[PDB]
Scaffold this active site. Structure first.
Site, PDB file in Angstrom:
ATOM      1  N   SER A  28      -0.613  15.698 -11.875  1.00 46.81           N
ATOM      2  CA  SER A  28      -0.866  15.346 -13.268  1.00 46.81           C
ATOM      3  C   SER A  28      -1.089  16.610 -14.089  1.00 46.81           C
ATOM      4  O   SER A  28      -1.657  17.584 -13.550  1.00 46.81           O
ATOM      5  CB  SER A  28      -2.078  14.400 -13.346  1.00 46.81           C
ATOM      6  OG  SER A  28      -2.491  14.162 -14.642  1.00 46.81           O
TER       7      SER A  28
ATOM      8  N   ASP B  95       0.841  -1.212   0.000  1.00 43.76           N
ATOM      9  CA  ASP B  95       0.000   0.000   0.000  1.00 43.76           C
ATOM     10  C   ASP B  95       0.867   1.250   0.000  1.00 43.76           C
ATOM     11  O   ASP B  95       1.316   1.657   1.086  1.00 43.76           O
ATOM     12  CB  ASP B  95      -0.876  -0.024   1.243  1.00 43.76           C
ATOM     13  CG  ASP B  95      -1.864   1.124   1.322  1.00 43.76           C
ATOM     14  OD1 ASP B  95      -1.983   1.861   0.329  1.00 43.76           O
ATOM     15  OD2 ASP B  95      -2.547   1.234   2.384  1.00 43.76           O
TER      16      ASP B  95
HETATM   17  C1  RD4 Z   1      -8.494   7.124   6.414  1.00 43.21           C
HETATM   18  C2  RD4 Z   1      -7.608   6.486   5.449  1.00 43.21           C
HETATM   19  O1  RD4 Z   1      -7.290   7.462   4.458  1.00 43.21           O
HETATM   20  C3  RD4 Z   1      -6.487   7.084   3.420  1.00 43.21           C
HETATM   21  C4  RD4 Z   1      -6.268   8.133   2.551  1.00 43.21           C
HETATM   22  C5  RD4 Z   1      -5.384   7.960   1.502  1.00 43.21           C
HETATM   23  C6  RD4 Z   1      -4.754   6.741   1.300  1.00 43.21           C
HETATM   24  C7  RD4 Z   1      -5.017   5.664   2.143  1.00 43.21           C
HETATM   25  C8  RD4 Z   1      -4.317   4.367   1.957  1.00 43.21           C
HETATM   26  N1  RD4 Z   1      -3.995   3.657   3.013  1.00 43.21           N
HETATM   27  N2  RD4 Z   1      -4.018   3.937   0.754  1.00 43.21           N
HETATM   28  C9  RD4 Z   1      -5.889   5.842   3.219  1.00 43.21           C
HETATM   29  C1  RD4 Z   2      -6.036   1.656   1.942  1.00 43.14           C
HETATM   30  C2  RD4 Z   2      -6.129   0.268   1.911  1.00 43.14           C
HETATM   31  O1  RD4 Z   2      -7.415  -0.113   2.438  1.00 43.14           O
HETATM   32  C3  RD4 Z   2      -7.729  -1.453   2.457  1.00 43.14           C
HETATM   33  C4  RD4 Z   2      -6.912  -2.364   1.803  1.00 43.14           C
HETATM   34  C5  RD4 Z   2      -7.269  -3.702   1.776  1.00 43.14           C
HETATM   35  C6  RD4 Z   2      -8.416  -4.134   2.411  1.00 43.14           C
HETATM   36  C7  RD4 Z   2      -9.223  -3.228   3.087  1.00 43.14           C
HETATM   37  C8  RD4 Z   2     -10.462  -3.684   3.747  1.00 43.14           C
HETATM   38  N1  RD4 Z   2     -11.438  -2.835   3.965  1.00 43.14           N
HETATM   39  N2  RD4 Z   2     -10.583  -4.932   4.120  1.00 43.14           N
HETATM   40  C9  RD4 Z   2      -8.873  -1.878   3.114  1.00 43.14           C
END
Ligand code: RD4
Ligand code: RD4
Ligand code: RD4
Length: 330
Positions: free
Chosen positions: A199, A35
């Site tokens: 971008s 991630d």
């Molecule tokens: C509250 C979570 O907010 C975000 C915002 C932006 C990116 C991600 C992420 N983990 N890819 C999560």
């Molecule tokens: C920012 C990444 O957020 C994720 C990634 C993979 C799974 C999940 C979930 N909700 N189980 C959430």
């Protein structure tokens, strides 16, 4: 040193990708979601509340001869989709694709939310954003990439995500066989802890390119492409019968449509996302309404170049003193 690991879509819709990661001694292999929009390496574990584990592989630190409790340290994360997890922290040896880090913080979940429990395919997360976002308290921890950096041949990692197929994460080198043409590099701001870039504009299908700055983040852990409402409206206006549905939670379109491509600018270069990448299938089994892969970023507060966009490119995450992103066609 270098590492190279294959990343595999968790389902037929590429909702996320999982990459095998070796933790501990002897190795415990867990399949983690890499991630670039978070900075925690956390896992399902022997500490995770038993009713919250449903098919995941767990990390058991007591079986690792190298697992050291980081005493006192806790973590807790909230993701953009509302999901969460929290726990305690061990340091251990972590390897990705043959690249090993000793003393990596491995955040052991005591609690996970329902979205995580209900996804049996993902055993945890490996964050690759900047370490300033890491949630460990009271001593913030480094990402796997930040810990590996000094040992790498080049301070880079690359994401080459597949379209309905496996792809690759490489660490420490740029595979010049994996892309076509040249890589266009663009500036990164680390002010918010993300791989944040601008971008240069967009086009819809065969339409003219609109030159316009779109700030956003390169985020492998987000499925979709989230862009300003103006841009998203302009895209879906080219699909007969597409509409924004408050009941479904975004743009939907008739499953009998053929979707136009979407182009985004990287400096003077262009990345073309084929229309079929923007198909995320029936909203429910058997429905003739399909869910769109380009959605509005209104309310999220940032634009997100998630997997829909990134899978159309070979993407370089350049972690040199002055970080940059690179994009190439492939
Ligand atoms: C509250 C979570 O907010 C975000 C915002 C932006 C990116 C991600 C992420 N983990 N890819 C999560
Ligand atoms: C920012 C990444 O957020 C994720 C990634 C993979 C799974 C999940 C979930 N909700 N189980 C959430
Ligand atoms: C194409 C003919 O029938 C379908 C049926 C259901 C979904 C889709 C789709 N666009 N993902 C297409």
């Amino acid at each position: 040193s270098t590492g190279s690991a294959t990343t595999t879509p968790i389902d037929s819709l590429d909702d996320a990708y999982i990459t095998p990661v070796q933790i501990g001694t002897p190795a415990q292999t867990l399949n983690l979601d890499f991630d670039t929009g978070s900075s925690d390496l956390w896992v399902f574990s022997s500490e995770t509340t038993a009713s919250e584990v449903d098919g995941q592989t767990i990390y058991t630190p007591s079986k690792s001869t190298t697992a050291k409790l980081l005493s006192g340290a806790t973590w807790s994360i909230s993701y953009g989709d509302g999901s969460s997890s929290s726990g305690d922290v061990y340091t251990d040896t972590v390897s990705v694709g043959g690249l090993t880090v000793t003393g990596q913080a491995v955040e052991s979940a005591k609690k996970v939310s329902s979205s995580f429990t209900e996804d049996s395919t993902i055993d945890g997360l490996l964050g690759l954003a900047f370490s300033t976002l890491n949630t460990v308290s009271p001593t913030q921890q480094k990402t796997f990439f930040d810990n590996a950096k000094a040992s790498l041949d080049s301070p880079v990692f690359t994401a080459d995500l597949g379209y309905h197929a496996p792809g690759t994460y490489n660490f420490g080198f740029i595979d010049t066989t994996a892309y076509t043409g040249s890589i266009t590099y663009t500036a990164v701001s680390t002010k918010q802890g993300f791989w944040e870039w601008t971008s240069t504009g967009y086009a819809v299908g065969s339409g003219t390119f609109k030159s316009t700055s779109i700030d956003g983040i390169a985020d492998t852990g987000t499925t979709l492409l989230y862009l300003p409402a103006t841009v998203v409206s302009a895209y879906w206006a080219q699909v007969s019968g597409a509409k924004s549905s408050s009941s479904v939670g975004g743009y939907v379109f008739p499953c009998s449509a053929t979707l136009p491509s979407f182009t985004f600018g990287v400096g003077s270069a262009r990345i073309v996302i084929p229309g079929d990448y923007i198909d995320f299938g029936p909203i429910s089994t058997g429905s003739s309404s399909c869910f769109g892969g380009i959605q509005s970023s209104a309310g999220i507060g940032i634009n997100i170049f998630g997997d829909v966009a990134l899978k159309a490119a070979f993407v370089v995450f350049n972690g040199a003193t002055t970080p940059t992103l690179g994009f190439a066609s492939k």
